[PDB]
Design a protein around this ligand. Sequence first.
Ligand SMILES: [K+]
Ligand SMILES: [Mg+2]
Ligand SMILES: [Mg+2]
Ligand SMILES: [Mg+2]
Ligand SMILES: [Mg+2]
Ligand SMILES: [Mg+2]
Ligand SMILES: [Mg+2]
Ligand SMILES: [Mg+2]
Ligand SMILES: [Mg+2]
Ligand SMILES: [Mg+2]
Ligand SMILES: [Mg+2]
Ligand SMILES: [Mg+2]
Ligand SMILES: [Mg+2]
Ligand SMILES: [Mg+2]
Ligand SMILES: [Mg+2]
Ligand SMILES: [Mg+2]
Ligand SMILES: [Mg+2]
Ligand SMILES: [Mg+2]
Ligand SMILES: [Mg+2]
Ligand SMILES: [Mg+2]
Lengths: 222, 53, 155, 185, 51, 148
Amino acid sequence: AEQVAAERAARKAANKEKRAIILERNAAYQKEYETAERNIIQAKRDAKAAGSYYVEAQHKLVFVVRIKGINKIPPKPRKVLQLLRLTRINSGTFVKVTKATLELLKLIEPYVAYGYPSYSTIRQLVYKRGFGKINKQRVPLSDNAIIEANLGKYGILSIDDLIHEIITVGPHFKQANNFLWPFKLSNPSGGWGVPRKFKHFIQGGSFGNREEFINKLVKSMN
Amino acid sequence: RVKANAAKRAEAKAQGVAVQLKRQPAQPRESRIVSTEGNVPQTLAPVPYETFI
Amino acid sequence: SAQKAPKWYPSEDVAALKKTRKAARPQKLRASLVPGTVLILLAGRFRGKRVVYLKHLEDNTLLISGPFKVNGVPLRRVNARYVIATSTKVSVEGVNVEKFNVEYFAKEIKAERVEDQKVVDKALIAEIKKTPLLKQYLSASFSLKNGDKPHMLKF
Amino acid sequence: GIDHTSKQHKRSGHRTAPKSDNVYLKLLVKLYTFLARRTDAPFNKVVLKALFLSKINRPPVSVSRIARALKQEGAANKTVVVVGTVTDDARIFEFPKTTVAALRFTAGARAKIVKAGGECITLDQLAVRAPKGQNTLILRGPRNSREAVRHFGMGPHKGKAPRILSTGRKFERARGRRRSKGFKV
Amino acid sequence: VLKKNPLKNKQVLLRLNPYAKVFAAEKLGSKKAEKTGTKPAAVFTETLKHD
Amino acid sequence: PSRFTKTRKHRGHVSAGKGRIGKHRKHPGGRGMAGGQHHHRINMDKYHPGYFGKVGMRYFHKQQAHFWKPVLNLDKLWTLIPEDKRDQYLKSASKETAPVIDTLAAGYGKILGKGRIPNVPVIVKARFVSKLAEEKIRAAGGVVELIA
RNA sequence: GAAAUUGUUGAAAGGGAAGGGCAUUUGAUCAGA
RNA sequence: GGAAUACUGCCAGCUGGGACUGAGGACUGCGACGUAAGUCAAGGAUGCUGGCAUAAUGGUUAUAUGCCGCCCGUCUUGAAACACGGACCAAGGAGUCUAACGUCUAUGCGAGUGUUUGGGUGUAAAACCCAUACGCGUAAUGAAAGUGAACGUAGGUUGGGGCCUCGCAAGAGGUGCACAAUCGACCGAUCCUGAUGUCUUCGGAUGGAUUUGAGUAAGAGCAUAGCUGUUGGGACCCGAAAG
RNA sequence: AAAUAUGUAAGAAGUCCUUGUUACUUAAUUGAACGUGGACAUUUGAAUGAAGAGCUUUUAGUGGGCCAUUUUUGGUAAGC
Ligand SMILES: [K+]
Ligand SMILES: [Mg+2]
Ligand SMILES: [Mg+2]
Ligand SMILES: [Mg+2]
Ligand SMILES: [Mg+2]
Ligand SMILES: [Mg+2]
Ligand SMILES: [Mg+2]
Ligand SMILES: [Mg+2]
Ligand SMILES: [Mg+2]
Ligand SMILES: [Mg+2]
Ligand SMILES: [Mg+2]
Ligand SMILES: [Mg+2]
Ligand SMILES: [Mg+2]
Ligand SMILES: [Mg+2]
Ligand SMILES: [Mg+2]
Ligand SMILES: [Mg+2]
Ligand SMILES: [Mg+2]
Ligand SMILES: [Mg+2]
Ligand SMILES: [Mg+2]
Ligand SMILES: [Mg+2]
């Protein structure tokens, strides 16, 4: 005849069970990451010791940031930017690398800087600027309950489950990445490192594939 | 593809549980080990200019 | 009717504030403010006076003394952000500052404060007198000279 | 700056209240707003939406239409709901006994229903009888039967009733309407 | 009412990610790598230093 | 009501909603139906096919009363019977004492056969009848009596 | 008994216009608790 | 041979200084610490202290200073223009009303609708009441003579909101108004076919068709009012040379 | 004989199996079209996105354009 304690205690117990599940899942993720990284290092060393060359696997994930404003964009690049959800300068999204998406990045190269995001970069992006689409409602990812309520049907129970599904391009990468609202980054805090942004990174500019330096750029933009 | 998909679905629901019936775009290449046995790398350099006319 | 009074009136009931999660944790004062340190007063009527630092008080003020006999600055509170902590230390083992607290300074000259001044000054001057020209140092007022650069100066 | 993929500040384009100032209609809208919010009943939501509709979007539903709907297999005992006016129809000679909830009844429609032995109730009585719309049957009149509709989309080879005041010979029937005078349409 | 950033606000960092306590306790951001001593082949070194 | 018109809302806007380039001039395209064959041909041909030319034969001194002949379909055929008597006529569908309906007195000249009627004999007095109207009236056990 | 325009008094500014925007100094003036 | 260091990258490593902000207003949530009680930096500022208590802050105003600021209106691809109007001020000054209409909306009634030509009546241009008509609608089609809308549960198929049954649910099945597509049926016109019969030239049954209609297929209209649009009117206002 | 640009398709209105209608078609239940009945929902058959999709009515203004890169015509050329 109370219907308060026999609910709050059960909810606290359910929260503790969920937290223990998240804890063990995050520990497993950390083990996975460390093992994969040390296996890449060891494979490179072993190939060198055997007189071979370890050709690392091509990158499956890119982070793309729109570095160009919204004026004077030709229609095909403009449509590709809208389909990659880069509708504003300094907006960023994760793109699973395939032929079909590489030919989009090719079209939008002069308007974006993109590259291969590290785990640290992805984790900091999701922690600080992570927002989800729920009635699309741009909801901040302040609690794991929101992530479970919207992506739990894909087995994603926490913000670290989401980060994992991003970094390792999982079976539900499309749903997790679309649930992620496009990241609204600031201008870089130490500048762009170049006097002019709108030539290719190779030519001393800012746009195009900057493959591993996207992590430094995004960290200074985050 | 329709006929192969029907055949694959039938053989799948007869053999086990796996479908994978959607086409996929060309995926990024997997890691590989490249040997130098009989394939020691040859060093190229840019050639000087000439007219050959 | 000159204004046709509104259909609805707001409630004249002041709402309670929601619970504030701001506890009062103790101040962490910089490591240079150790009791016995000679301080330079930056503001107030005794600006430029060099004084001796004493017990750290509960209102976060520093209890300082001239000593009053040395430069005329009595026992008084001071704000830590308005002093420069020099690297000149006297020993305050022997001075009883347990008596002086916030209530001690709550708002002609009280004989009680005169006698506490005498006791503290007598405990401090004895320690001062074994450092040559430390009494003269404390009697002299600090000032910036032409070319003094406080970002380069050490105290 | 944002490259907007859609019109900004676009209104939904649907009525959220009746344009009518009928206080009783507004009371019905209040009741069905409460019901649609706190019942999870698709019936309540669609009735709330229907209560907003303009007159040409609430074409009258005749007792003939009600009788055919009740002749539907299994509908004979369902309460017919018409968010609008129920009109009489003398072209039918055997009306069944039924319950009809409607915004308005014509004198003849009410008389026919009651003489057949049923009841004409209002939508709030319907809400009390079936708060979730249990055993209801929502009927809608023939919208695309208005005289104005037959002129919509007028053009060559459309067959869509020119807008005309006087009809007959000498009135828009000679050149462009027959092959003997220039061409046909 | 207010977005509090993890990567600061340790409280929020712990509300999310219960594994952060274990990470910090075991110092997994400063993990020591097991030592190995594989040496590159002479062909690798000769190719690398080839002009 | 003038206070609800858009000309109150155009006060302060120079062109009154009529444009700066193409102003509100007097009669830019001609008055009335001017140019229906020359510069309004598209608007005539679309939305008014058949407007120009002659389509039939004339009739000098036509009197519409010569053609007065209101049509009543069989689907009503009973609204002409008083409501009270209609129930007791529907009951007792006798070949004797069948209700007599004066359609001319009701104001109709021809009875058409659109709907269907109950199987009760009715004596229909009309000036003209459709073939199927008479067939249905006879199938219901009634008869059509021609009047003038 | 308005304005244009004008006299007097008072105040203020003024090196080839004046007027205006943001901000503040100065002078004058003033409401609110 | 053993190190170091640089460079790059990682840390849910520690920590100092500076700036802007303090939205919200009982509780509710997720957490953290704690053995537990409770505590907390955990769904947004509190604690302590001082001076002033009024022109001090602030507002207004004039001026000064820094930077900026071309004359509005108009036609125009383009106006500060060496394009036009404007010396100044007051008052006046330009989309109106009407006949007939399109769409949309509100209202009344609804297969009907419209009392107000007129009559009755009146507290007298009001309000109130009313017969017969008439208008529009309820039938279309054809030049016309003329003919004139159910094979059928007013059809079949597909989709269809809602409802109904089963199910914890997911879903499955049934019924499916509006509405959409399509194939049919019915009425009129056109072209054919041409039964019984007969004023032997009338009648036109029945069956058809790459034909046609602003049609039928359980009616939606009528009236009043409003914005907007249309046409005639001086017709948004002012303006010819002319006749 | 490119590059760029461009048509179509990437499914449930689908695929497979059986057999009913016809005055069409075949030498012929031959076929054509439309059906009845039966089987197949995790990826219902690429990617990405989708302040949703579809539909209707009715009206304003406009119907002098000019400029930049690139393609390009006349012209010696032009702020042509
Ligand atoms: K015009
Ligand atoms: Mg800087
Ligand atoms: Mg630059
Ligand atoms: Mg917010
Ligand atoms: Mg404007
Ligand atoms: Mg003008
Ligand atoms: Mg006077
Ligand atoms: Mg004056
Ligand atoms: Mg370093
Ligand atoms: Mg001030
Ligand atoms: Mg300037
Ligand atoms: Mg010009
Ligand atoms: Mg101008
Ligand atoms: Mg000039
Ligand atoms: Mg001029
Ligand atoms: Mg002038
Ligand atoms: Mg005036
Ligand atoms: Mg004139
Ligand atoms: Mg003349
Ligand atoms: Mg023009």
